[model samples]
Target: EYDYLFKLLLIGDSGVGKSCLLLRFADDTYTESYISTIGVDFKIRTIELDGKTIKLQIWDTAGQERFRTITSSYYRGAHGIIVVYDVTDQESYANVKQWLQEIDRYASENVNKLLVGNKSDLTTKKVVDNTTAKEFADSLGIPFLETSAKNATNVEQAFMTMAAEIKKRM
Candidate 1:
């Protein structure tokens, strides 16, 4: 089988739990508290998808204001971008445009994009739902998924779907 290496970057506001998702996917465990990723932390996973070996390099980015200044540097070889936001946080959900804008600013190429509404485990205080998230993702020519990092809800599927689409395009 052939092998293709793809790099992905996770970009979102601080506390959106991108690191948590990355950790869960990479390590198959959850960490309660994660210090802000000082720079960029990358994890590589090789998997057999569609009879081919694909190496996925997932990059967890720092969400701090000061960190954003240097984060754009990590976008150089990104194959796809996953933008995450907290479902219970209206500000985080509302700032989707801002995150997209940030991606546009850093990555000017034709890159695969995904909009993720995280923290789906908390049903009581949901600020956004599937319908709205799906609509937004469709409108942006991307995929959208509401997931729970804690429970690994659709977490891997989200990345798999994006990778499948990107591979098809490539």
Candidate 2:
């Protein structure tokens, strides 16, 4: 049994590493080969915070255009949303705005949101600067973090930060 249950959604452009982040957070594993998510998938992780057991139900949505219909349906009940973009791909980073707009149209009005820049370890290929990303998140009043699923850097922190914020709201 858990003291709290939070539904979180993961959204971004395809190949942005949304699923990889979920895998890293829920299973503590990561793979280099890319396998596209078909529609929407979920994983559960229970964590203890402030002596309370919290269950996080994270929905990892497919980023491809074809799954838009299905993915939009999953947003209504989310307590938090993680909008991710690949640091190595400028296009993915640019598309983050569109993903946020999707959240605005689908998720609840006060849903907690976090801006994530994935693949942070790929410094040579990184195009999205941390300062710019942080400024953007600040402008929108959302927490932000740069994470590397491959190295497990900030993966747990990202989820825990979201959980802590949601818990505060509860």
Candidate 3:
């Protein structure tokens, strides 16, 4: 068995860059063209944390309603959930509460949660400010981060932070 295995669930509205974030975190790459994930896609990456090898199973779920419903079941046994939103999309940002509700229903009570504002590189189009997102995250006792999958900013930090928190709790 591995030293530790962490499951990370990525959830957000359509076109919020969840897939891009997963690609950057797991594969260290990004793609411009938005590919609509049908159901669930997975990527694996292992990193050393606190002198232990941690294997991450990153789940990239479809943002579509039908697919999201199916993907919610995948949350079983997830150690962390990365709820993503598009900084440029107001609707996606507003849906964070809904995603959190789903997480509450599907995930364990003590599962680590993180709020990620993706596409931070697109400053001109950014509508959701960090203060607003962070405040909401704080209200729920979760960590928040802003990331740019295109430029690869804060992507690693977000995962590392989650992984470290999970390890600490474990």
The residue pairs found clashing in candidate 3 are none
Task: Output the number of the lDDT-best candidate.
Answer: 2
* Residue pair clashes in candidate 2: none
How do all the candidates rank in terms of lDDT, highest first? 2, 3, 1
- Cα lDDT tens digits for candidate 2, 1-170: 78999999999999989999999989988999999999999999999888989999999999999999889999999999999999989889889889899998999998999999999999998988989999999998999999999999999999999999998987
- Model 2 bad stretches (over 4 Å): none
Which candidate has the top score in TM-score? Answer: 2
Alpha-carbon RMSD, each predicted model: 1.3, 0.8, 1.1
Q: What is candidate 2's TM-score against the reference?
A: 0.98
lDDT of 1: 0.85
Candidate 2, position 93, lDDT: 83
Candidate 1: list runs displaced more than 4 Å. none
For candidate 3, write residues 1-170 as lDDT tens digits: 46999988898899999888888888888999977999999999898887899999988899999887799888877899999999999999999989989988999888999999999999998999999998988887899999999999999999999999999997
Tell me each candidate's TM-score: 0.94, 0.98, 0.96
- Candidate 3's error at 26, in angstroms? 1.6
Alpha-carbon error at 149 in model 3, in Å?
0.4
- How far is 37's C-alpha from truth in model 2 (Å)? 0.2
